[PDB]
Design a protein around this ligand. Structure first.
Ligand code: MG
Length: 460
DNA sequence: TTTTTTTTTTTTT
């Protein structure tokens, strides 16, 4: 049984992993060294008739719902192809921004179509990765050997195509699958030691081994939330485990200003923390970040950021060191910072994270999954979690409408009307109109916009 | 195994 990597990319009909719908899936299996060892896997998803794609998405992809309808299968079947692949044992599933995008799409796809939302990321020696912060880490800590591209600002960029184009390699789902593989090869070759460190430290216990909460042991963290002006980097001190989020540890940015932490109380810090930057004043921002141990965060030994590297990124070493001393010498801050986080929708599509399912409920859902579509009306199952009845109804109506009775068909009509209100339909047309006037002399973009209008006429 | 819709930021469609 061989360890593989499954590189994958989704095209979608919008940015929202729960509310929007997938259009296309692309994947290829490689060996540990990133040599291709299987056929390309590309296929489309038919959108159910309770949905209209966002115009912006479709303009970027070039994939129309008509195209997807013609070329694809229903979501249930789409979910089932994606799942067989994903649950091949000893598979590491990865892409480019997948942890914060594609993996969300996957969780919701399995959630909607009765597969476990997470098991593909851990069962049977499975795992996941994401090359995005690998690229960021490399630039920040061992930039040598790779060309780092900039914007009209001078800031380093990490858009995939910007990176591949800058390194003489090369929208199209399968093309992005190759670009990701190519990017994995590049770093592996130019910086194997860092690559090894980041691969090994995906592990949460490996990460906990690095996290010393009681002593506030300083670390280097790379993250987009720091922004390209610092090359996404800073030194960090772990203060506490998040009181409500098992996968989060509360951390202080040692480069920021630690006086609002020293001075304000917990309630004022909380209020300060949740004020936007624009409607923030002459006041300092609270320099606290959550780091999520399950999301392949880049966390290394403090001294991994080399003096010259810190100097390149313009990160004040002594300032950090000063803050770390103060924080260690003011234990009460920890009490306040934790208290910040100890405070705490009718669409079932949006309620995946409401919680796990009981044991009765998972066995029942298992049976939903194993039943031929045609046989579900004959089932009559009882669930406890109120999500499931709704999950089931959407599942059946969206994927197997030939299967619904009149009551169910009436319920579905109602549902469609509640989605396609006149106010929603007005909003959709306005956007299309607005867009057709912006790209009036673009034969490609005008024809997409037009196909989107027709599709709305034809399904609503 | 997980964090949904207050903040940071940048990328994903
Ligand atoms: Mg992508």
């Amino acid at each position: 049984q061989q360890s593989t990597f499954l590189f994958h990319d989704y095209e979608t009909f919008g940015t929202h992993p729960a509310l929007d719908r997938p259009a296309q899936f692309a994947a290829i299996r490689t060996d540990s060294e990133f040599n291709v060892i299987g056929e390309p896997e590309v296929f489309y998803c038919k959108p159910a008739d309770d949905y209209l794609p966002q115009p912006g998405a479709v303009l970027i992809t070039g994939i129309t719902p008509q195209e997807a309808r013609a070329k694809g299968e229903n979501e249930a079947a789409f979910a089932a192809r994606i799942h067989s692949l994903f649950t091949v044992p000893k598979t590491c599933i990865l892409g480019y921004n997948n942890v914060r995008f594609d993996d969300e799409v996957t969780r919701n796809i399995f959630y909607r179509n009765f597969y476990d939302p997470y098991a593909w990321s851990w069962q049977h020696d499975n795992s996941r990765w994401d090359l995005l912060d690998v690229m960021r880490a490399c630039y920040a800590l061992r930039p040598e050997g790779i060309n780092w591209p900039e914007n009209d600002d001078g800031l380093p960029s990490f858009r995939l195509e910007h990176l591949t184009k800058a390194n003489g390699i090369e929208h199209d789902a399968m093309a992005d699958v190759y670009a990701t593989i190519a990017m994995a090869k590049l770093v592996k070759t130019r910086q194997p030691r860092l690559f090894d460190y980041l691969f090994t430290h995906r592990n949460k216990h490996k990460l906990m081994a690095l996290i010393d909460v009681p002593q506030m042991k300083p670390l280097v963290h790379v993250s987009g939330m720091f922004g390209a002006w610092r090359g996404n980097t800073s030194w960090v001190a772990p203060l506490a485990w998040h009181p409500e989020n098992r996968n989060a540890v509360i951390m202080v940015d040692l480069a920021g200003d630690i006086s609002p932490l020293l001075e304000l109380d917990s309630d004022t810090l909380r209020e300060r923390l949740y004020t936007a930057k624009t409607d923030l004043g002459d006041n300092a921002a609270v320099p606290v970040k959550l780091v999520h141990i399950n999301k392949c965060p880049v966390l290394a030994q403090a001294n991994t950021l080399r003096p010259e590297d810190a100097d390149r990124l313009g990160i004040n070493r002594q300032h950090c060191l000063d803050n770390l001393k103060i924080l260690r010498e003011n234990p009460q801050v920890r009490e306040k910072v934790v208290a910040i986080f100890a405070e705490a929708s009718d669409n079932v599509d949006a309620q995946l994270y409401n919680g796990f399912f009981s044991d009765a409920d998972r066995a029942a859902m298992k049976i939903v999954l194993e039943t031929e579509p045609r046989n579900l009306p004959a089932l009559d199952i009882t669930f406890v979690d109120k999500r499931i009845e709704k999950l089931l109804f959407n599942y059946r109506a969206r994927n197997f409408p030939g299967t619904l009775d009149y009551a169910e068909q009436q319920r579905w009509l109602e549902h469609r009307r509640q989605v396609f209100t006149p106010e929603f339909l007005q909003g959709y047309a306005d956007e299309l109109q607005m867009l057709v006037q912006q790209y009036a002399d673009d034969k490609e973009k005008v024809a997409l916009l037009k196909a989107l209008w027709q599709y709305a006429e034809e399904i609503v």
